[PDB]
Amino acid sequence: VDIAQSELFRGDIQWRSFHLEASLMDALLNDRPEFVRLLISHGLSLGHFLTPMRLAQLYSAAPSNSLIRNLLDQASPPDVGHVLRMLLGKMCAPAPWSDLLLWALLLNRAQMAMYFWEMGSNAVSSALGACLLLRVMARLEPDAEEAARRKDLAFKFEGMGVDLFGECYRSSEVRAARLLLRRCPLWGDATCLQLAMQADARAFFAQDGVQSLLTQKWWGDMASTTPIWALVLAFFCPPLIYTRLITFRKLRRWFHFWGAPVTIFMGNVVSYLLFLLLFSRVLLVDFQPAPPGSLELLLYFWAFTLLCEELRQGLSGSLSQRLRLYLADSWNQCDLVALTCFLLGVGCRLTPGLYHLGRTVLCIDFMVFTVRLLHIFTVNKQLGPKIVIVSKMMKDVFFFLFFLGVWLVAYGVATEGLLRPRDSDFPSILRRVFYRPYLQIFGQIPQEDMDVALMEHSNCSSEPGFWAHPPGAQAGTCVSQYANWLVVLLLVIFLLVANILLVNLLIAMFSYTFGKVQGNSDLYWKAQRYRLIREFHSRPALAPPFIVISHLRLLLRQFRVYLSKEAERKLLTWESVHKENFLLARARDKRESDSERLKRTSQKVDLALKQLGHIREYEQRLKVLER
Amino acid sequence: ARARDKRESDSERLKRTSQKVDLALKQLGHIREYEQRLKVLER
Amino acid sequence: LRRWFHFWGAPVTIFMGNVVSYLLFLLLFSRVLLVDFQPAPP
Numbered sequence A: 001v002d003i004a005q006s007e008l009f010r011g012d013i014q015w016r017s018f019h020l021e022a023s024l025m026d027a028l029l030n031d032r033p034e035f036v037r038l039l040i041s042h043g044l045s046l047g048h049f050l051t052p053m054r055l056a057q058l059y060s061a062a063p064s065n066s067l068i069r070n071l072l073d074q075a076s077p078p079d080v081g082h083v084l085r086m087l088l089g090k091m092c093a094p095a096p097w098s099d100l101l102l103w104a105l106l107l108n109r110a111q112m113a114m115y116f117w118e119m120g121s122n123a124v125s126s127a128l129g130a131c132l133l134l135r136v137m138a139r140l141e142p143d144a145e146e147a148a149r150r151k152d153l154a155f156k157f158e159g160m161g162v163d164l165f166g167e168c169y170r171s172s173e174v175r176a177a178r179l180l181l182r183r184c185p186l187w188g189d190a191t192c193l194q195l196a197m198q199a200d201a202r203a204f205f206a207q208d209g210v211q212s213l214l215t216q217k218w219w220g221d222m223a224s225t226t227p228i229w230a231l232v233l234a235f236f237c238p239p240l241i242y243t244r245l246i247t248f249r250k251l252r253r254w255f256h257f258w259g260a261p262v263t264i265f266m267g268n269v270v271s272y273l274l275f276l277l278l279f280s281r282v283l284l285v286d287f288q289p290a291p292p293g294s295l296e297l298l299l300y301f302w303a304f305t306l307l308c309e310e311l312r313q314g315l316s317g318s319l320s321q322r323l324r325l326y327l328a329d330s331w332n333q334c335d336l337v338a339l340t341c342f343l344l345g346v347g348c349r350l351t352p353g354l355y356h357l358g359r360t361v362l363c364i365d366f367m368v369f370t371v372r373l374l375h376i377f378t379v380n381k382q383l384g385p386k387i388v389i390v391s392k393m394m395k396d397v398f399f400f401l402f403f404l405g406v407w408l409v410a411y412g413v414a415t416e417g418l419l420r421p422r423d424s425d426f427p428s429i430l431r432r433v434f435y436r437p438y439l440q441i442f443g444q445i446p447q448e449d450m451d452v453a454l455m456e457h458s459n460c461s462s463e464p465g466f467w468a469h470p471p472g473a474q475a476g477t478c479v480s481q482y483a484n485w486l487v488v489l490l491l492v493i494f495l496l497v498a499n500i501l502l503v504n505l506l507i508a509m510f511s512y513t514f515g516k517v518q519g520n521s522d523l524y525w526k527a528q529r530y531r532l533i534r535e536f537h538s539r540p541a542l543a544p545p546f547i548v549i550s551h552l553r554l555l556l557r558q559f560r561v562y563l564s565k566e567a568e569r570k571l572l573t574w575e576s577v578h579k580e581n582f583l584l585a586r587a588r589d590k591r592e593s594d595s596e597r598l599k600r601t602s603q604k605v606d607l608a609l610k611q612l613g614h615i616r617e618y619e620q621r622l623k624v625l626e627r
Numbered sequence B: 001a002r003a004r005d006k007r008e009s010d011s012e013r014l015k016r017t018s019q020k021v022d023l024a025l026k027q028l029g030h031i032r033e034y035e036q037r038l039k040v041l042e043r
Numbered sequence C: 001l002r003r004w005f006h007f008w009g010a011p012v013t014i015f016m017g018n019v020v021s022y023l024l025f026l027l028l029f030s031r032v033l034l035v036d037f038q039p040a041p042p
Ligand SMILES: [Ca+2]
Pocket: A310, A313, A331, A332, A335
């Protein structure tokens, strides 16, 4: 590149546009980012440079054994638009810098892609979309090295987007939020939050600016500074919302209080608690073989409106893409299972001969429904990480269950074989093998049913030997006395292993996993906070029992910012200014590092040595001449 | 004491060394030019 | 036939077959111990 610098810096020689374009094409084809930077920086008009034939040639320069070439020929001029649309999805798939950036991302030219990003216009959305695209392509790379390179470049682009938004937000919160919530035309009119959700950029959600924006959207039209007690007080007595307790602007006031996501969340929590109370009241008292009463019909209508709401938020959650995204959430699976169990229980009950089966199904369905209340504490800032840490402990739980099952089988079968009770019915065998040793882990040790010194000695059994009568109801009629000391020793070893070793080991594993995964679980909570807020943003303002009204309107009719062209161009210019400032600061910080100082010092010492040698030779020549 | 401890850090030593090498380069260039001029004059 | 010997010859398939056989062996052992084991000839 030094030769190019020397040639192009000459003032006597000027270079016409033809040579510049030829050299630019050569450098773009041959992957020389420094040359393309030099040529473009020397007054080159890139807009007139690019032609459809030039882009076709650039895409034809793809390697023969490359994923981009494979997909381009599978789609069949380069019809890369179809390739993009089949990669990302119709929701978020796509100075011609955007085209060059897309080409470099497709061909995995890391420095070319970074340089094009540094010269782009919509920098934050381009970084998020590039991270999404690189992750998607890494999902399709057969070579592990290609997948690793794509994931590394995706992480680099995510870091660039996070840093740029951090720079922008510290300038003005209003314009940064406007940039974050706008729709980018290049990436299918998807907002930066949608792209960050699609790309699983959890580090983008975890920063302070995005979290503050999410908190602002969570409180709706009232001030985020509003405390919880004031909100609850205003909720319970609606006419009190008009006083100075709640600060707004951040009949109209009524719709601004009852339309906030947090108010809808609280209304749904209250309605769910009342639904559980009604369910328990019906289950414990009202449920009778007689035809359903008023409370049963009210419960059925409540469950019907719950099902309608689940259907609505599954449809509104590509139809197949929306269905997959709705089913991908565990809290929605917990709703679907509960509703299916409710339907099965009611259907069984309505049959005259299946009343008890229906009641049992509904009794289990009550547990299924009540488990859903755990979603309430995913909104807390302190206990939000805890619930997502807890979900990581299932490996330890299942390890403990497997070890416990093996040990219970061994100990129970050995003890049952030693005792030889005469009531050897299969349910009794299973009970004395599994249920009793399991209860011995929780302080329920039936010594009178196992230790022969505590029993009565009688010759009930006709078989030869000695036998004793345990007073237990399901402990067998009589047991053998041959090796009772071994039964006692087996009990001692069981208490030593199960009550101490396994439980202490499980505690150790829980502590280890907690300390290992707390850091990632915090970020996961911060990422899923957006899904929570966007779920409650579009919900109807009514509670489920009355929500059939809102759904009716939604049947009667069968996160966005609108910007004019001038406002959009001003926002993009501001973003580009901040990107240039950030890049210059990063480059300056790199240049002032100790390694760079040492390198420059070494180069200057070499230059001094060359000058010293030249002076030495010239002094020798002068001395020779003057003598 | 704090200022002295900061001045004796490796980063400051490297910075001062770079500045002194630049000064040496300037003096070497001056001596080069003066030697060329002296050789021209004496010939 | 080659596909048959390629499925039943894999190490993981042999591992699963041995796991199933060991579980059945333990079940038979427990059945013999708790019920069948009597002073009469086996
Ligand atoms: Ca739901």
